[PDB]
Amino acid sequence: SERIVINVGGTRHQTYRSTLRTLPGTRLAWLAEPDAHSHFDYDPRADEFFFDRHPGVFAHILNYYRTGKLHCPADVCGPLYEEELAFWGIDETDVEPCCWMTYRQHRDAEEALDSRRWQPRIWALFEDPYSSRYARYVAFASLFFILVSITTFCLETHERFNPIVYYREAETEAFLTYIEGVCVVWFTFEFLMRVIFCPNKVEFIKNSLNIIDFVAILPFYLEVGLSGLSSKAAKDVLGFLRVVRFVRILRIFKLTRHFVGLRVLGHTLRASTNEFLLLIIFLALGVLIFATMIYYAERIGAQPNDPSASEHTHFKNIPIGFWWAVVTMTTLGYGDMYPQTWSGMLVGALCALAGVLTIAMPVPVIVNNFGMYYSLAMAKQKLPKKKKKHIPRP
Amino acid sequence: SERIVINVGGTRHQTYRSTLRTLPGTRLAWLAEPDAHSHFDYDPRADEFFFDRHPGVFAHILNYYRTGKLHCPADVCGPLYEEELAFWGIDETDVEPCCWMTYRQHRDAEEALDSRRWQPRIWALFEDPYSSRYARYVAFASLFFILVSITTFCLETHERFNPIVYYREAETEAFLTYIEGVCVVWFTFEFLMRVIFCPNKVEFIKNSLNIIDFVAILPFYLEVGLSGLSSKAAKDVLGFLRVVRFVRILRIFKLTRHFVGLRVLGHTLRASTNEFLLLIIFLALGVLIFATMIYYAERIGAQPNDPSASEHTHFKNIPIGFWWAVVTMTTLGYGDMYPQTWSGMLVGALCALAGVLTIAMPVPVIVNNFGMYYSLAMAKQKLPKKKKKHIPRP
Amino acid sequence: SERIVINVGGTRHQTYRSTLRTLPGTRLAWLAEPDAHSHFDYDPRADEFFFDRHPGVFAHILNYYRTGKLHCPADVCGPLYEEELAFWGIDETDVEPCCWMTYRQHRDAEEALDSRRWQPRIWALFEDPYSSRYARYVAFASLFFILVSITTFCLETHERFNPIVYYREAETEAFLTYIEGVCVVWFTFEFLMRVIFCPNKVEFIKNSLNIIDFVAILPFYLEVGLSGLSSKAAKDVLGFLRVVRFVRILRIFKLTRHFVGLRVLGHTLRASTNEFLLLIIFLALGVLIFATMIYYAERIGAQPNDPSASEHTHFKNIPIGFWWAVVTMTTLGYGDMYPQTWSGMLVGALCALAGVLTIAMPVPVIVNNFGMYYSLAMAKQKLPKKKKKHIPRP
Amino acid sequence: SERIVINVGGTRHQTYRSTLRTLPGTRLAWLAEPDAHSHFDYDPRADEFFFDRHPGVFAHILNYYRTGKLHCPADVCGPLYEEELAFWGIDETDVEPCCWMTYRQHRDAEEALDSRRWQPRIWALFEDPYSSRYARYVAFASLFFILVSITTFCLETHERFNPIVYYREAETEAFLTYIEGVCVVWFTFEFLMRVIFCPNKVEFIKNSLNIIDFVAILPFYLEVGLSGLSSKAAKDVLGFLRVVRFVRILRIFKLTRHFVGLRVLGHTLRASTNEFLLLIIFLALGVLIFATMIYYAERIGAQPNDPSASEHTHFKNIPIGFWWAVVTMTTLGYGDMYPQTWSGMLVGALCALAGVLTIAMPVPVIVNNFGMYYSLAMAKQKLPKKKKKHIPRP
Numbered sequence A, B, C, D: 001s002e003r004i005v006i007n008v009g010g011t012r013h014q015t016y017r018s019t020l021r022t023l024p025g026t027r028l029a030w031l032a033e034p035d036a037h038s039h040f041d042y043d044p045r046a047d048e049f050f051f052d053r054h055p056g057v058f059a060h061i062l063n064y065y066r067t068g069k070l071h072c073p074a075d076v077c078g079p080l081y082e083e084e085l086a087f088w089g090i091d092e093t094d095v096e097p098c099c100w101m102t103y104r105q106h107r108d109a110e111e112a113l114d115s116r117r118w119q120p121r122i123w124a125l126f127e128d129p130y131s132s133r134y135a136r137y138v139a140f141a142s143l144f145f146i147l148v149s150i151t152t153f154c155l156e157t158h159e160r161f162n163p164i165v166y167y168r169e170a171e172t173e174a175f176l177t178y179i180e181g182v183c184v185v186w187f188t189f190e191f192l193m194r195v196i197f198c199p200n201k202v203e204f205i206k207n208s209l210n211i212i213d214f215v216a217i218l219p220f221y222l223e224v225g226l227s228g229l230s231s232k233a234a235k236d237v238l239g240f241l242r243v244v245r246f247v248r249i250l251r252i253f254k255l256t257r258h259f260v261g262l263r264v265l266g267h268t269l270r271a272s273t274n275e276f277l278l279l280i281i282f283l284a285l286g287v288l289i290f291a292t293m294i295y296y297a298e299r300i301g302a303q304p305n306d307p308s309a310s311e312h313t314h315f316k317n318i319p320i321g322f323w324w325a326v327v328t329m330t331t332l333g334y335g336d337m338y339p340q341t342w343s344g345m346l347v348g349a350l351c352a353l354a355g356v357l358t359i360a361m362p363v364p365v366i367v368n369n370f371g372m373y374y375s376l377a378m379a380k381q382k383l384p385k386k387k388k389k390h391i392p393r394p
């Protein structure tokens, strides 16, 4: 009477019936019911109910009934305790905040890391680099052409290839367009080939890489076909396309999607927006305050000879002090503008220290997130897959 | 005789009666008393006293009796062990320093994070941003006006808006005062409205935000009403108020009290004064020593032609060397003053290394405190509240 | 029937026969066999099988059968659990990724840290510094000569020792060759002595230190013997050898192989190639993007008077912007080139912040690896060796 | 026969007699002896030996017998396991390196943190600041005078107080000597007073603070008494003492010995010599290598017009490159010398990255040591002392 013994894997557990009756609906509440012999396994010889579960972790679950607080043991992994409490019918959202972050720690990372007879032949040839042997060579050729185009784009801006000769203006070397045309013909061939053999055309269009590639390809054709009449409009649009040429520097992301580190970095960035917002707010407040202080401190040494007190200082006003504050708070220190008054040097020292602290605040959080994600992702490489040795249904 | 058995949740614990008698007053001391059968639950069939507690944590409490030292197990949370030792009557202030910081770790953070029929309608409309729908719009309007006033304050100091025309002096653009007046009429309206419908007027006055707002509002009225006679006094007070204009840059803190990160930062700053004092002392000692050394090192290359040996160096004396030491110890390095002698370069290298070390000493402590506070505070957002499932009194 | 009890070191474990039959081939599968009494120790009085193993760690192994997932307890060391699961016949490559990195953590470090009657007398005299008393003195003499040669090599490039006097050219001081000859005779003696008394001559040649030493010695002889005819060839080869003189600065690695810290650093570098690759890729992407942005941002303030818009800026093109991006992303900030336009300062601030983040990403991983390796290596110094007290075969 | 049962605090432990016989001399070896009934507590009714010890930690000690390896559980503190293994007679120096650093972790810190009827009245008045009420005021007066002397010493070097008037030379202001004399009379009084009432005079002399104070006091008397004849010797010694004046800046350490942070820093420095040596060696190697590389890289752009190729570069030689390497490897970047050739910029980038890595290697070790020491020392402030409630001898 009022005493019940629980046998969990050969380990006896003894408690009062009243304590088991605290939480209704749960399996233990069913066990506290007097007519539960036909429900659970029970032997009248020992008068103890039998289970088959981990005996070292049932203690915390029972202690939740005994006291009222739910905690997770630190000697077992999170998923193991989660499964164990799921079996007994305890809702996992009742654990105390003292031991919540470690509990829901691996699950978030795990879920974030996972968040026409020839059409299969053609589509797999261009998409998966290692689905075959030829796809590797195609990917390497694309890498070569991308690097060539980027190199040409960087060279076009140099003064050696832009002689001065409209009266004078300046012209780029002719072959710097021929190389670009050689790259463009291949890029057009590849884009046209893949847009035909892609299932779910609308999904293909919705992708950002495809539109980036199309936008990169278009200006060459526009320029080569728009060298005729309408002088004003032609000259405006040619300058606009000359500016927009930069979009072909973004094609490098097309072939770097297969690198593990970049995917880990992308997940880290997507999972750490709040820290970026916090860092931006901290920097804004610090920059504003220190710019105001450094502006007002440098006016002490104002010479009593000029109508404008800003002749002996680099800090003519506050907005120009924003730049100095940003440079100084990150320990960069270009040196183009620095305090020159005994009162300004104290503010400079304070600015340096405050910048160090306010930068060191959230960066460790971001770095820890990246480290955890990277470790988890790199663990997958060591263990490819197994053959599910544990056959269920004993 | 001299042998007793303790049953803690189905787990047998056996010890001599003498060991239980070490600590008087405690529940175990009562248990060691021969006439305790009427006090505690006891069955003559098994001759063991019965309890209902966690069996895996009673071992450490009993070991405290057995040896004399009190330690906390590392497989359970701090609060769980604290409650368990509280039940048995053991004072928590007796644990050894080897395992004290982890024990009293969550409690400090938890306590620090928590450290006229229309008057309710009016007061809640201005104070709580999200107590209703209109309060959100009022807060947004206040944000707009605050940003406008700050922008005008920053613009007033620029040279483009201060043409030179008393003989010449300089004047600010007229509309830069009209915008400020438009902001200040709203600010006056809001401040006057809230000061009427605030319960506990003295508490309202004691708040720093209200006095900041009043001090920000006052100078505009003083200037607009004090443009008359008494030329000397008027000209002095106008300059004084022109200086004090900066106080309206502090109203940004009025609406940032609702951001979680800033509250966490405030708690971190309030809980880490000792580390700031330590950092300041370290920096002072380093700056003094290295300024002296760099002053004395640069005099080796003194040219035997000038009465003052400080003509070939930036280090004319020690106080000017304070600035170089501060700049160099934080890896900032403006470059306005640097050593130029073979003996000074060694001191410069030593200064850089010592600065790195003496900065890296306490900053990790401060950062760890901030990280723990931020994690605990952010855990609250995920779990709003529950319905107290565990009904007491079994 | 369908119920079995396992006795592991005095601790009863109870489970159904069906659960033990999940994994075939394992020892428990043999135990589930009905005719296992003649195989394992078993007493009909208690009807329980007896073992001699740790009872606190068998629970997780049995739980692997009960649920299907394999985890490692956090209350015991990795090697202990590894040995325990090896005894029971469980393959260690089945543990979940949630608890894999900590499991295979010490093993990798441990394996990485371990990855003619006079010939023994002569060879040990030069190789092992502390195999005797004389070897210490020989090593010290070699250190002295190496330092002298390095000092002379550094001095040869100074202008004080290179007076101008072929019509003018320049000549080095004579004694700067005599000191080198004095060092070279000893180095030749040592190298000749060790190459004779080295077993496995081909292995000796395969070593990098020996070829480094030979390459360092050779140019002195070549120069001292090649000051004759064939003016053109002699003058070319003399300049080439003057350039190659630098190889004698690498002999310092010959005597630093015995320092523990350098060996730990070598192991850390060899074990962290992926992080270096990741860091290089991140830096390349950041430098490219920010160089492009800073080039395009500075052209806003182009003066409408010059054909080339790059007259008011340091950023004449993109390749020169690579250098500024590299300098700025590491918070170095020489200051030789900095933005001077309101649009360029925003890009500069973004570049500084992005550089800080992208550097702080993988460096903690590398540092953690070094710290673990160094701690493990320094643990060996405290404990030299023992006398294997535990005699096997009880 | 061949089977024994051990009762450790109510927990049954069962093992073969042969396993207990592995380690001789230990208490378990005595227990394996057949004639041990008269030695240990034993009851023939249960045929089990009884002990009074922690049952959860005896498992690892027994497992040491079972397998041969000794490990420490991670669920208990180091001192608890140390005491437990000390009781059973196991030498603590046999634990494996896999779990040695955490075991011997608290002990090292704990031991390092602890490594004439009026004579008691007088001596305590000057030494202990808070042994009384007057000692506090005496310490404050000493602080005031020390600060005044340091301020005067710093002011003496400024140009404002050194007018030019031997023909011209320069003289310091007269009162800058009177203030020093006022400080010196008090310092002499204090030093003379304490040197009389100090027990163990030789120990008093052996202290560094006393000799520092005496050396600081002496030059004032020497100067004030040595303004007479022997012009050459007087003028030499006066300059020497003018140089040695700096020793009075070190008296600040006299009163900072009572600050907790400085004592913690001293212990950290004394306990981390190896890391400093490692850091110095790393920096030396890096500086040498990168100085050589940057010297040889800048000679590519040598103009074919000058005899000395070092006219277009800051890197005239290697020793001057040492300074640039030191400045660049710490991300300081003064900017007084920087590469100006496309080949030198690559070396500069490599130097910056290598410097960051080689600095970030051992600094975390040093910082972790400081943090542990500081936490342990600061824990003492919270818990002053107790009254040893646990009375031994049950």
Ligand SMILES: CC(C)CCC[C@@H](C)[C@H]1CC[C@H]2[C@@H]3CC=C4C[C@@H](O)CC[C@]4(C)[C@H]3CC[C@]12C
Residues within 6 Å of the ligand: A293, A296, A297, A299, A300, A343, A346, A347, A350, B243
């Ligand atoms: C020690 C810490 C708090 C830093 C010290 C900051 C001091 C030096 C700064 C901060 C605010 C500054 C003052 C703000 C406003 C003005 C008005 C101007 O017309 C003259 C200088 C004067 C009066 C400044 C003097 C210098 C000042 C007092």
Ligand SMILES: CC(C)CCC[C@@H](C)[C@H]1CC[C@H]2[C@@H]3CC=C4C[C@@H](O)CC[C@]4(C)[C@H]3CC[C@]12C
Residues within 6 Å of the ligand: B293, B296, B297, B299, B300, B343, B346, B347, B350, D243
């Ligand atoms: C190697 C470490 C300890 C750094 C070395 C510091 C050396 C180079 C510095 C520190 C103190 C310096 C000395 C202090 C005082 C003077 C008096 C002055 O009239 C001539 C230079 C002279 C004699 C300095 C020479 C340079 C010096 C010895």
Ligand SMILES: CC(C)CCC[C@@H](C)[C@H]1CC[C@H]2[C@@H]3CC=C4C[C@@H](O)CC[C@]4(C)[C@H]3CC[C@]12C
Residues within 6 Å of the ligand: A243, C293, C296, C297, C299, C300, C343, C346, C347, C350
């Ligand atoms: C706020 C964050 C996103 C940074 C802001 C970057 C801005 C200021 C930069 C990035 C790209 C830049 C533009 C890129 C291209 C050109 C073409 C050039 O002929 C005129 C300037 C112009 C139009 C630039 C103006 C400044 C610009 C818009």
Ligand SMILES: CC(C)CCC[C@@H](C)[C@H]1CC[C@H]2[C@@H]3CC=C4C[C@@H](O)CC[C@]4(C)[C@H]3CC[C@]12C
Residues within 6 Å of the ligand: C243, D293, D296, D297, D299, D300, D343, D346, D347, D350
């Ligand atoms: C990519 C990594 C390895 C950095 C690249 C370092 C390169 C650019 C450096 C390192 C060593 C340098 C060479 C070393 C020696 C000399 C001899 C000199 O009379 C002409 C330049 C020359 C031939 C240097 C050219 C630049 C050089 C090759």
Ligand SMILES: [K+]
Residues within 6 Å of the ligand: A331, A332, A333, A334, B331, B332, B333, B334, C331, C332, C333, C334, D331, D332, D333, D334
């Ligand atoms: K700098």
Ligand SMILES: [K+]
Residues within 6 Å of the ligand: A331, A332, A333, B331, B332, B333, C331, C332, C333, D331, D332, D333
């Ligand atoms: K810098």
Ligand SMILES: [K+]
Residues within 6 Å of the ligand: A333, A334, A335, B333, B334, B335, C333, C334, C335, D333, D334, D335
């Ligand atoms: K600089």
Ligand SMILES: [K+]
Residues within 6 Å of the ligand: A330, A331, A332, B330, B331, B332, C330, C331, C332, D330, D331, D332
């Ligand atoms: K820096």
Ligand SMILES: [Zn+2]
Residues within 6 Å of the ligand: A070, A071, A072, A096, A098, A099, A100, B077
């Ligand atoms: Zn908890």
Ligand SMILES: [Zn+2]
Residues within 6 Å of the ligand: B070, B071, B072, B096, B098, B099, B100, D077
């Ligand atoms: Zn402890």
Ligand SMILES: [Zn+2]
Residues within 6 Å of the ligand: A077, C070, C071, C072, C096, C098, C099, C100
């Ligand atoms: Zn796990």
Ligand SMILES: [Zn+2]
Residues within 6 Å of the ligand: C077, D070, D071, D072, D096, D098, D099, D100
């Ligand atoms: Zn271990």
